[model samples]
Target chain A: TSMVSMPLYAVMYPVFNELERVNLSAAQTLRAAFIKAEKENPGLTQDIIMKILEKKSVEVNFTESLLRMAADDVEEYMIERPEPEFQDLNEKARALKQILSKIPDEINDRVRFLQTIKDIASAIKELLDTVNNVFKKYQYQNRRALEHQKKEFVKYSKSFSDTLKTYFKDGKAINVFVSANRLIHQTNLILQTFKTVA
Target chain B: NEAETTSMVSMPLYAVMYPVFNELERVNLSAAQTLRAAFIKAEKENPGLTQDIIMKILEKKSVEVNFTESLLRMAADDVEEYMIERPEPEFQDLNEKARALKQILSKIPDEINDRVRFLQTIKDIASAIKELLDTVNNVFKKYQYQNRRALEHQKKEFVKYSKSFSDTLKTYFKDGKAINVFVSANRLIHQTNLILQTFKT
Candidate 1:
C-alpha cells in the first residue's frame, strides 16, 4: 500500500490530471472480466484474469489513444493565452508608442497619450498579482534577497501609478511630460529588478 | 552444481513508461504547432510578403511532426514488445521460482501431503513476480530521467533561439522610422523555424 505512492506513480501528478481515469478504466476492465469469470466457475476466474492481462499487455491501440489524449492535455497547458488585462495593457502600450512616435501636438492628443499610459500603469499593477503569487510559491535559499527585490518592484509600480494620477487631473502637457518621464525612470528600476531574477 | 542451476533457471522480466514517451511527443507537437502558427499569423498580417518563408517553416514543422509521431509510436510498440519478449536480469530468479512452483504442482500426491510446502512455493513465485515488477518499474524510472534531460535540452535551445530572434528584431530597426514591417515579420518567421530545430531529435 505504501509503495503505491512512489515517484513512479507521482510522475504524472504535475503533468496529467487524467491519470485517475486511466487507472479507473484499467481496473474496471479487469474487474468486469473477473465478475464474468466468477459467474462461469471458480477455477476459471484466474485463467480469465490471466488472459485479460495478456491481452492488455499486447495492445497498443488503447495506449495510442492515451498518448493522443496526453498530447492534447499538454498542448492546452503550454499555450500561454494572454489574460484580458495583459492584452489590454499590450494594446494600450502599442497605441501609446504610436502616439509617442510623433509628438502629441494637440491638447486632447496629449491628454489621450497621458490617459493611455496611466491605464497601462494601473493594469500592470493588476498583473502583479501573478508575479507576487509566483514568487511566493518558489522562494528558495535566496528568499531574503528576492523579498527585497519584490518589495522594490511593488514600490516602483506604486510610485509610477501615483505620478501618473498626480499629473492626470491637471491636464497640463508639461506636467504630464514630467510625470511620464518619472514613470520611465521608475520603469528602469523595475526592469533592473527583473533582470536580477531572470 | 552451476550447470544444474543454469538448467533450473530459464524464463522472464519487465508501462510506467507511457507518460514519458507521451511527454516527448507532446513537446515536439507543441513546438511544431508554435512554429507553424507564428508564420501563419505573420503571413496573414503581412500578406504574400512571407509566403516563401512560411512554406519552408511548414515543411520543417511537417518533418518534425512526423518524427515526433513516429518516435512516440515506436517507443510504445517497443515497450510492449520488450515487456513480453525481452530477457532481463530478474528472469533468472523468476524462472527458478516458476520452475519450483511448477514442480510442486506436478507432484500432486506430494503437494497434498505437504500442503504447507506447496503454499510456500506459491508465495515464492509471487515474490519473484514482485521483483520482476520492481525491476520494470526501475526501467520506467530510468526512461523518465532520460526523457527529462531530452526535454530540458530542447527548452534550453528554444530559449537560446528566442534570445537570438529578439536580437534580430532589434537589427531591423534604425533610429525609429526604419523599422521595416516585412523585415521584422520575416525575422519572426525565421525565429519560428528555429523552434523546429530545437525538436530536431
Candidate 2:
C-alpha cells in the first residue's frame, strides 16, 4: 500500500549509476561504435560537449543516431548497450525499472523520469566541468605546497645530496618536481573514483 | 524452583535500556520517539518476546527499522562520496546527515548494543531485512536494494558470516555439541561489524 509513493530513481540510482560508469568507460573502447552514425566521437564525452557548444552546431557528439539528444537517449543508450562488463547492471536495470515504473502514473511518470534524467545530464555536465578543472586546481594547490617545502629544503641543504636526496638522488630538478606532483596525480584519481560513478 | 525462577527474572526492560533510550531521544528525537511508539504499537498488535514479536510484525506488512536505517546510511554514503570528489559543495543536505552519521554509526556498537548494525554494521541487518522481506510480498519495495549485486553480494556474505557465526556459536554453546542451533540475528549484527570494520581500513 505504501510502496506507491516511492520515487522511481530511489530504487534505481545504482542502475543509472552503473550505466553512467559504463558509457564513460565505453566512450574509450567503443570509439567507433557509432562509426557510421552522423557524428564524430571526440576523445571523450566531454570533448564532444566542448566541440558541440563552441559552434552552436553538433554534427558529431556522444550519441548513436539521427535524433535530438534527450536525456532518455542517455539512459537508453546504456540500457540497450550493456557491454560485457556490466551485464548484471543491465539485468537489474531492466527488472527494477519494470517494477519501479508501476509506482507512478504513466503520463506523469514519463514526464518526471525524463526530467530527472535531464537533471542527471545537467549534473553530468557540471561534473565534467568540475573534473576538467580539478586537475589544474590540484596542480595549483600542489605547486603552492611544494614551493613552501622547497623553500625550507634549500635553506638546510649544504650539498646537493642533502636536499631531498631520497627524491632528488639524481640532482635533477624535474625529478623532484615530478615526484612531488605525482602525489597530486595519484590522490586526485583515488578521490575521483567514488565521485566518478555519476 | 518456580519462585526462584520468577525471582531471577528481575531485570526490568527500562532499567537496563533507559540510559541508551534517554540519550537517543535527546539527540535524535524523531527517530527515537517514533521507534518507541512503533515498538509499543507492535507489542499491542502481537504479544510475545520483544524481539520475536517485533520480528514477526516486521515479517508481516512492514519494512524493518533496521532496513530503513540501512537505506539512510546508504544515502549518507552517497552524499559523502559525492562531496569528497566534487569541490563545489553542491548537495543541499550533503553535510547535514552525512557529517554526523559516521561517528554515530561507529558509536552505536560501543554505546548501545554491539548487535545494532543498521546504525553501525551493514551485512546482517541489511541481509536480515532482505531475508525476512523475501518471504513477504510487495512489502518493502521502498527499501529495495540499489546495488545490482546487493543480493548476490549479500548471499555470499551470509554464507561467510554464517560459517564464522556457526564456528563461534558452537564454541559459545554446550561444548560444540549444541543441536538444531542457528545463529542469532544479534550475533550476526556483531560479526557484520567486525566484517565492515575490516573493509574500512
Model 2 lDDT, residue A197, Cα: 32
**What is the C-alpha DockQ of each candidate?**
0.01, 0.01
Interface root mean square deviation per prediction: 21.7, 27.7
**Candidate 1, which CAPRI tier?**
incorrect
State model 1's lDDT. 0.35
| Clash list (residue pairs), candidate 1 | B14-B136
lDDT of 1 by residue, A1-198 (tens): 122122112221221233224344433332343334334433332221222223332222232222222211112112133554434433433333333222223335666655666555555554455445445333466556546755765675566457556655743333333333333333334334433553
Identify the runs in model 1 with alpha carbons over 4 angstroms from their true place.
A1-107, A110-118, A136-138, A168-171, B1-201
Best by lDDT: 1
Candidate 1 residues B1-201, lDDT tens each? Answer: 744532111100002112222333454554333323433333334332222221222223323333323332233222212122236644443334333333322232233235467456445534543443344344444434345665455445434543453453345333221112222322323332332332232
Question: On a 0 to 100 scale, what is the lDDT of residue B141 in model 2?
Answer: 37
Q: lDDT, candidate 1, residue B43?
A: 32
Model 2 Cα lDDT, one tens digit per residue, B52-150: 211122122112233333433343333233222323322222233233333333322232233344224444434443442242222213224553344
Lowest summed lDDT window (length 10), candidate 2 chain A: A62-71
